Amino acid sequence: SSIPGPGYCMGIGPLISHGRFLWMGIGSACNYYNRVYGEFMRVWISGEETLIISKSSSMFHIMKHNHYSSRFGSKLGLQCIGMHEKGIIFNNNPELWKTTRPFFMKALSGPGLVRMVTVCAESLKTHLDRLEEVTNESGYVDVLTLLRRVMLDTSNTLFLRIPLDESAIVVKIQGYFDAWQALLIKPDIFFKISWLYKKYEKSVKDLKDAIEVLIAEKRRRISTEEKLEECMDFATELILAEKRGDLTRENVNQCILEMLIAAPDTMSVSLFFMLFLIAKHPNVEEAIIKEIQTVIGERDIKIDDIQKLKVMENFIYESMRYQPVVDLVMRKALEDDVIDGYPVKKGTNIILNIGRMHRLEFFPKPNEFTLENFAKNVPYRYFQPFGFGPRGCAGKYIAMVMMKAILVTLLRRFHVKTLQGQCVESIQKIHDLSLHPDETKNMLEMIFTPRN
Ligand code: HEM
Ligand SMILES: C[C@]12CCC(=O)C=C1CC[C@@H]1[C@@H]2CC[C@]2(C)C(=O)CC[C@@H]12
Numbered sequence: 001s002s003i004p005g006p007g008y009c010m011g012i013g014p015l016i017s018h019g020r021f022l023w024m025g026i027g028s029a030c031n032y033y034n035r036v037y038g039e040f041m042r043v044w045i046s047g048e049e050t051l052i053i054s055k056s057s058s059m060f061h062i063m064k065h066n067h068y069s070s071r072f073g074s075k076l077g078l079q080c081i082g083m084h085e086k087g088i089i090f091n092n093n094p095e096l097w098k099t100t101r102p103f104f105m106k107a108l109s110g111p112g113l114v115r116m117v118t119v120c121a122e123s124l125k126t127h128l129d130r131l132e133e134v135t136n137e138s139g140y141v142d143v144l145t146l147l148r149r150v151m152l153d154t155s156n157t158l159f160l161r162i163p164l165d166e167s168a169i170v171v172k173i174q175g176y177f178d179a180w181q182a183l184l185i186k187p188d189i190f191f192k193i194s195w196l197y198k199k200y201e202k203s204v205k206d207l208k209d210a211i212e213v214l215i216a217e218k219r220r221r222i223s224t225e226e227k228l229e230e231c232m233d234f235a236t237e238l239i240l241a242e243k244r245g246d247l248t249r250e251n252v253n254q255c256i257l258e259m260l261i262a263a264p265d266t267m268s269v270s271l272f273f274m275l276f277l278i279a280k281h282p283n284v285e286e287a288i289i290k291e292i293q294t295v296i297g298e299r300d301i302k303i304d305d306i307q308k309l310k311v312m313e314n315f316i317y318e319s320m321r322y323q324p325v326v327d328l329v330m331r332k333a334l335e336d337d338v339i340d341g342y343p344v345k346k347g348t349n350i351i352l353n354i355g356r357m358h359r360l361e362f363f364p365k366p367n368e369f370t371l372e373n374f375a376k377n378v379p380y381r382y383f384q385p386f387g388f389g390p391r392g393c394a395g396k397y398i399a400m401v402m403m404k405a406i407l408v409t410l411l412r413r414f415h416v417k418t419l420q421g422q423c424v425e426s427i428q429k430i431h432d433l434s435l436h437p438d439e440t441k442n443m444l445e446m447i448f449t450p451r452n
Helices: 013-024 026-036 056-064 075-081 094-107 111-129 143-159 166-183 188-192 198-224 234-244 249-279 282-295 303-308 310-322 354-360 396-413
Strands: 040-044 049-053 329-332 337-339 342-344 349-352 414-418 429-431 435-437 446-450
Touching (some): 013 040, 026 040, 026 049, 056 337, 056 349, 056 354, 075 166, 075 188, 094 234, 111 143, 111 303, 143 166, 143 234, 143 249, 166 249, 198 249, 234 249, 249 435, 282 310, 396 414
Parallel strands (some): 049 349
Antiparallel strands (some): 040 049, 329 349, 414 446, 429 435
8 A cells, every 4th residue: 555645846845744734733744744644654754654543443552662662842842941862852862761661660550659649639639629729800710820830830830859949840840841842843954043042941951950950859859768667759860870870860861851841741731622621511510529428428538439430431531532732743764664555764854643533533522521421441452542562642541540639629619610602612722733722712711619
């Protein structure tokens, strides 16, 4: 099988397609190109041939096998944000990625995942008592900012635990994400004309310098520390690995950065969307509340409770299916292969359009939000919200814990209303690297009225 997609008009196809990605945003471009051409098609980002693929089979092949455990993107852009051959998220050096990932994987499972269930709860509680910090005169809560701050507090107290300016760092993290998003697929040309990216360069510096402060203190505390065996955590594990000779200070520093931003970037937007679904789906809200009564009562949330919360689990999955935040995934082929029908050379970029795939394949009612879609056990090869295999989401397990943890603690205490008719469908979203609300609009606030 030869490959679908636009014509290579002797060097115009590549320029229009890259330009389309820049103009529309990565995610909407992927959808455009899938809807026009096949569910398996070719495009160019910069020069290199880049496949955009929504076919469940192809997705599964790619994530399963070890010769796709790379991503891609502008080397100059990645260098700019400090992700070029450094952390793990966009660390495309196979050997260096291989050696770094285990640190993340240890921290996001076993005992740390058990700790997380209560660290999440206490953080949100603590923030819901300080609801003045986020609420209007008119009673409107800035849910996004609330969520970001608890995601950051949570992440800190589990992986690092140094005191910090919660509010300031949340704003800096947003700046870093925006920068990352901007520069990820910008052509080299862009980086020559340098009053066009100095803007972003400063966002990165601001976050990177704020974290250098924290990791500096963390270093001091480790050197003085007496019973070092007792109080292990992600930051420490890394720092100790450097102190052997396994890791580089620069790399450590990026991994710490990357762990802190991860949840503020993604969890908060997912829970936001989930809250807007709860608002406009009262049928489901009851079921969830009934389940909480049955299972938890007015006891504190505990690790053993989370498996029992079957309805909420399905709610989360359906929210992530229907309204994804991470609707697409970037890989690269490290060896040649045949993939479904088509041949794929090494160095070929890949974009798995998992958000489109969740509407085209397995589910009874793909285009409407219903828990009937998760009434019958879903095979993991028809629904990958986190990905799987050697480079799947490192937080995939702990994330589900955290989402159940915060929804329970919030919905226990507050009914959630949404201003006007506003719903997830009527929210105006940007659809570039991730899929998230356009924050330059308004009517993104919510209202929290008590229970009992
Ligand atoms: C709703 C929540 C989340 C979703 C939907 C999500 C989804 C994803 C997806 C699709 C990937 C790409 C995996 C692949 O290429 O197959 C990914 C990567 C990643 N996620 Fe998440 N994620 C979430 C939360 C988190 C959290 C809370 C953390 C950390 C605390 C995290 C850390 C990562 C990391 C480190 C990677 C990169 C793995 C690598 O490239 O080696 N994620 N995530
Ligand atoms: C989940 C994630 C990591 C943690 C974080 O801080 C923010 C994001 C959002 C973008 C995700 C990324 C992981 C890698 C993804 C899936 C891609 O290959 C394209 C989009 C990108």
